[PDB]
Design an enzyme around this catalytic site. Structure first.
Site, PDB file in Angstrom:
ATOM      1  N   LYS A  36       0.832  -1.184   0.035  1.00 22.15           N
ATOM      2  CA  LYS A  36      -0.129  -0.004   0.177  1.00 22.15           C
ATOM      3  C   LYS A  36       0.797   1.251   0.166  1.00 22.15           C
ATOM      4  O   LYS A  36       0.427   2.275  -0.623  1.00 22.15           O
ATOM      5  CB  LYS A  36      -1.029   0.007   1.426  1.00 22.15           C
ATOM      6  CG  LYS A  36      -1.729   0.901   1.230  1.00 22.15           C
ATOM      7  CD  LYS A  36      -2.896   1.100   1.958  1.00 22.15           C
ATOM      8  CE  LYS A  36      -4.197   1.976   1.759  1.00 22.15           C
ATOM      9  NZ  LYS A  36      -3.543   3.408   1.354  1.00 22.15           N
ATOM     10  N   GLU A  68      10.691  -5.089   3.395  1.00 22.78           N
ATOM     11  CA  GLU A  68      10.768  -6.361   2.643  1.00 22.78           C
ATOM     12  C   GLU A  68      10.336  -6.400   1.140  1.00 22.78           C
ATOM     13  O   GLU A  68      11.211  -6.756   0.464  1.00 22.78           O
ATOM     14  CB  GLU A  68      10.082  -7.335   3.628  1.00 22.78           C
ATOM     15  CG  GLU A  68      10.739  -7.424   4.893  1.00 22.78           C
ATOM     16  CD  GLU A  68       9.836  -6.300   5.795  1.00 22.78           C
ATOM     17  OE1 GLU A  68       8.971  -5.622   5.371  1.00 22.78           O
ATOM     18  OE2 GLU A  68       9.981  -6.643   7.189  1.00 22.78           O
ATOM     19  N   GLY A  96      -4.948  -5.454   5.767  1.00 23.87           N
ATOM     20  CA  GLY A  96      -4.289  -6.412   4.879  1.00 23.87           C
ATOM     21  C   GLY A  96      -4.913  -7.703   5.001  1.00 23.87           C
ATOM     22  O   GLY A  96      -4.938  -8.499   4.003  1.00 23.87           O
ATOM     23  N   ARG A  97      -4.946  -8.053   6.494  1.00 25.14           N
ATOM     24  CA  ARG A  97      -5.380  -9.665   6.580  1.00 25.14           C
ATOM     25  C   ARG A  97      -6.802 -10.015   6.148  1.00 25.14           C
ATOM     26  O   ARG A  97      -7.480 -11.293   6.426  1.00 25.14           O
ATOM     27  CB  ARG A  97      -5.211  -9.979   8.030  1.00 25.14           C
ATOM     28  CG  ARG A  97      -5.788  -9.160   8.906  1.00 25.14           C
ATOM     29  CD  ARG A  97      -5.297  -9.453  10.354  1.00 25.14           C
ATOM     30  NE  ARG A  97      -5.914  -8.595  11.496  1.00 25.14           N
ATOM     31  CZ  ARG A  97      -5.357  -7.536  11.920  1.00 25.14           C
ATOM     32  NH1 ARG A  97      -4.317  -7.090  11.727  1.00 25.14           N
ATOM     33  NH2 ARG A  97      -6.079  -6.640  12.725  1.00 25.14           N
ATOM     34  N   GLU A 139      -3.423 -12.201  14.547  1.00 22.69           N
ATOM     35  CA  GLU A 139      -3.215 -10.776  14.375  1.00 22.69           C
ATOM     36  C   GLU A 139      -4.370  -9.772  14.722  1.00 22.69           C
ATOM     37  O   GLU A 139      -4.334  -8.864  15.072  1.00 22.69           O
ATOM     38  CB  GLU A 139      -2.630 -10.223  13.066  1.00 22.69           C
ATOM     39  CG  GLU A 139      -2.011  -8.987  13.068  1.00 22.69           C
ATOM     40  CD  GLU A 139      -1.205  -8.684  11.723  1.00 22.69           C
ATOM     41  OE1 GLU A 139      -0.116  -8.439  11.670  1.00 22.69           O
ATOM     42  OE2 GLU A 139      -2.013  -8.712  10.642  1.00 22.69           O
ATOM     43  N   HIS A 199      -0.855 -38.018  10.267  1.00 21.66           N
ATOM     44  CA  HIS A 199       0.158 -38.709  10.407  1.00 21.66           C
ATOM     45  C   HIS A 199       1.414 -37.966  10.854  1.00 21.66           C
ATOM     46  O   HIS A 199       2.610 -38.654  11.048  1.00 21.66           O
ATOM     47  CB  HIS A 199       0.550 -39.372   9.029  1.00 21.66           C
ATOM     48  CG  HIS A 199      -0.504 -40.401   8.857  1.00 21.66           C
ATOM     49  ND1 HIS A 199      -0.804 -41.688   9.271  1.00 21.66           N
ATOM     50  CD2 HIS A 199      -1.644 -40.358   7.695  1.00 21.66           C
ATOM     51  CE1 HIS A 199      -1.779 -42.240   8.834  1.00 21.66           C
ATOM     52  NE2 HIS A 199      -2.367 -41.287   7.889  1.00 21.66           N
ATOM     53  N   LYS A 206       9.798  -3.601  14.457  1.00 18.73           N
ATOM     54  CA  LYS A 206      10.171  -2.623  13.137  1.00 18.73           C
ATOM     55  C   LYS A 206      11.213  -1.526  13.671  1.00 18.73           C
ATOM     56  O   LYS A 206      12.138  -1.316  13.076  1.00 18.73           O
ATOM     57  CB  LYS A 206       8.985  -1.788  12.662  1.00 18.73           C
ATOM     58  CG  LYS A 206       9.258  -1.003  11.459  1.00 18.73           C
ATOM     59  CD  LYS A 206       9.903  -1.443  10.332  1.00 18.73           C
ATOM     60  CE  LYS A 206      10.445  -0.234   9.447  1.00 18.73           C
ATOM     61  NZ  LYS A 206      11.120  -0.576   8.238  1.00 18.73           N
TER      62      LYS A 206
END
Length: 547
Positions: free
Chosen positions: A208, A214, A268-269, A354, A385, A513
């Site tokens: 955004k 990153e 965002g999520r 979050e 398993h 951050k």
């Protein structure tokens, strides 16, 4: 305040729930033995969908009290405040309107005095037209070739949703090959592009702000890789942006025509339904993306309009509160019996944890009760398993959702009946276990003697009373995937309302951050670092000796 701010532990329903828990044993074998109607009374059948919550550790009284709790926290009021665009995200002063992304213009929602539906539809149409040109081959790369590979670059909400949906809908794929870069570890992009051709690769830069460290470090590495073959003026042919920072995008070399907008009321999520879904549009085509949004809208209408006793997300939410706050269960497992849902539990880790991993209530006071649980899981039969040993015989109470489809997209021999026999059997085993008497009978049947039986019996016993929900959809399609994701979106909302927390901010990411911003220039110089605690200092200085 926007949402009401009721402390759940101060309600009448909470006190009644505490009393009822303290004086009631919830044994699943007994509950089913005493009422042959238990499944019929504790399940919801909704067209092609069955949501069976009868293997939960609840009786009729607990169930009614859990609905009373939702009502005493003013859940209906909260639902309408979200859907109609009230500023329910109070710490950032924002609306919460991922639901408006998929309402197809059927409701006009106002934000800052402007209707938003025209904006939502504008970007959807922009994604439709752009995707058609890439998929059809009309959009050529710098040497005149059709695009063959799409690489999404993003983090968090700009990555997990695209990854999960594109994996889940692989049966519905277009000709394009999809790829997802997210780690700032440069080995991620290095391995992804190792076999790609710059002439035929399209990059989506999802940020955004267009300053995410990153994502933009990865974006620059993609451009440098591209520029080994293409020219600077070719970047606009091969790179697009999901962003609102117009000048930063243009400076990178992307054309303003290929910026896809989304808004601050899209978390965002909760963003795969927006421009952030462009990689989904390319992966499966726009018509399938529309079907995905229609499935979410179907769940939206179900959640908004249905009385709580027949409302699937409300039941998911209040049952989770029951286990978290009364049974003191720290985790909730997500166990989908489809290989296509291999990244679904990972997606819910962000969407759920979050959102509700919070310890301050909507009045600004620290909570003294538990909020969001740890979400985890793997698809069945793979997780089955790996770690079910602990669910069956460990010391931890782990409630879980089992999810399945009646039909397989690719139906091979007897794979699907075999898969589903495990889906049914595991929740049966988790609920009802196996008694000492049953174990002794089986040990005698295998020829064991008295000493062997006495030693082995407890190791082979299963206590049971691990609760589950089971979902059966008819088939995995874009629509039913949209239904399912949206069920969990609203479960999370219900729990945040009841826990009196803010589900739509994320102040907890700021400290890491800020501290990384201070450390980065310290790693690039040659000095011995002494500015931190002795552990941070020692780790940095060891790193510098070996880097």
């Amino acid at each position: 305040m926007s949402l009401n701010t009721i402390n759940p532990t101060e309600t009448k329903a909470w006190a009644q729930l505490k009393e009822h828990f303290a004086e009631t044993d919830f044994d699943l074998k007994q509950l089913f033995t005493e009422d042959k109607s238990r499944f019929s009374e504790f399940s919801i059948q909704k067209e092609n969908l069955l949501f069976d919550f009868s293997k939960n550790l609840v009786d009729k009284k607990a169930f009614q009290l859990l609905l009373a709790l939702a009502e005493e926290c003013h859940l209906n009021d909260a639902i309408e405040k979200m859907f109609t665009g009230d500023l329910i995200n109070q710490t950032e002063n924002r609306a919460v309107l991922h639901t408006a992304l998929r309402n197809f213009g059927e409701e006009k929602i106002v934000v800052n005095g402007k209707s938003i539906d025209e904006d939502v539809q504008r970007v959807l149409n922009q994604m439709k037209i752009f995707s058609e040109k890439i998929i059809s081959g009309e959009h050529k790369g710098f040497s005149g070739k059709e695009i063959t590979d799409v690489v999404n670059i993003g983090i968090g909400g700009s990555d997990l949703g695209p990854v999960m949906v594109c994996s889940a809908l692989k049966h519905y794929r277009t000709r394009l090959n999809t790829h997802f870069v997210s780690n700032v570890d440069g080995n991620h992009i290095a391995e992804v592009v190792k076999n790609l051709n710059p002439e035929t690769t399209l990059f989506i830069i999802a940020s955004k702000t267009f300053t995410t460290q990153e994502t933009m470090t990865n974006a620059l590495s993609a451009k440098e890789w591209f520029l080994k073959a293409g020219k600077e003026e070719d970047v606009a042919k091969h790179f697009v942006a999901l962003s609102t920072n117009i000048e930063a995008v243009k400076n990178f070399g992307i054309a303003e025509e290929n910026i896809f907008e989304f808004w601050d009321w899209v978390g965002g999520r909760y963003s795969l339904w927006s421009a952030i879904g462009l990689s989904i549009v390319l992966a499966v085509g726009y018509d399938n993306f529309e079907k995905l949004l229609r499935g979410a809208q179907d769940t939206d209408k179900h959640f908004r309009n249905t009385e709580f006793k027949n409302n699937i997300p409300v039941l998911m939410g209040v049952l989770g509160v029951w286990y978290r706050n009364f049974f003191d269960a720290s985790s909730y497992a997500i166990l989908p019996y489809s290989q296509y849902l291999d990244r679904f539990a990972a997606y819910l880790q962000q969407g759920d944890m979050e959102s509700n991993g919070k310890s301050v209530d909507r009045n600004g006071e620290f909570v003294d009760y538990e909020t969001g649980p740890i979400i985890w899981g793997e698809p069945g039969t793979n997780g089955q398993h790996a770690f079910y040993q602990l669910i069956h015989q460990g010391t931890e109470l782990i409630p879980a959702d089992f999810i399945a489809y009646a039909k397989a997209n690719n139906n091979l021999s007897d794979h699907q009946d075999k898969l589903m026999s495990n889906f049914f059997a595991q929740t049966e085993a988790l609920a009802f276990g196996k008694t000492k008497e049953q174990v002794i009978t089986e040990l005698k049947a295998s020829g064991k003697n008295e000493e062997e039986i006495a030693f082995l019996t407890n190791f082979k016993t299963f206590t049971g009373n691990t609760p589950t929900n089971s979902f059966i959809f008819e088939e995995l399609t874009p629509f039913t995937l949209g239904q399912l994701i949206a069920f969990y979106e609203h479960k999370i909302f219900v729990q945040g309302v009841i826990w009196n927390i803010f589900s739509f901010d994320q102040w907890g990411v700021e400290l890491g951050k800020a501290l990384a911003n201070k450390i980065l220039p310290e790693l690039e110089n040659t000095a011995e670092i002494t500015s931190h605690d002795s552990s941070t200092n020692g780790l940095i200085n060891f790193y510098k000796k070996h880097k």
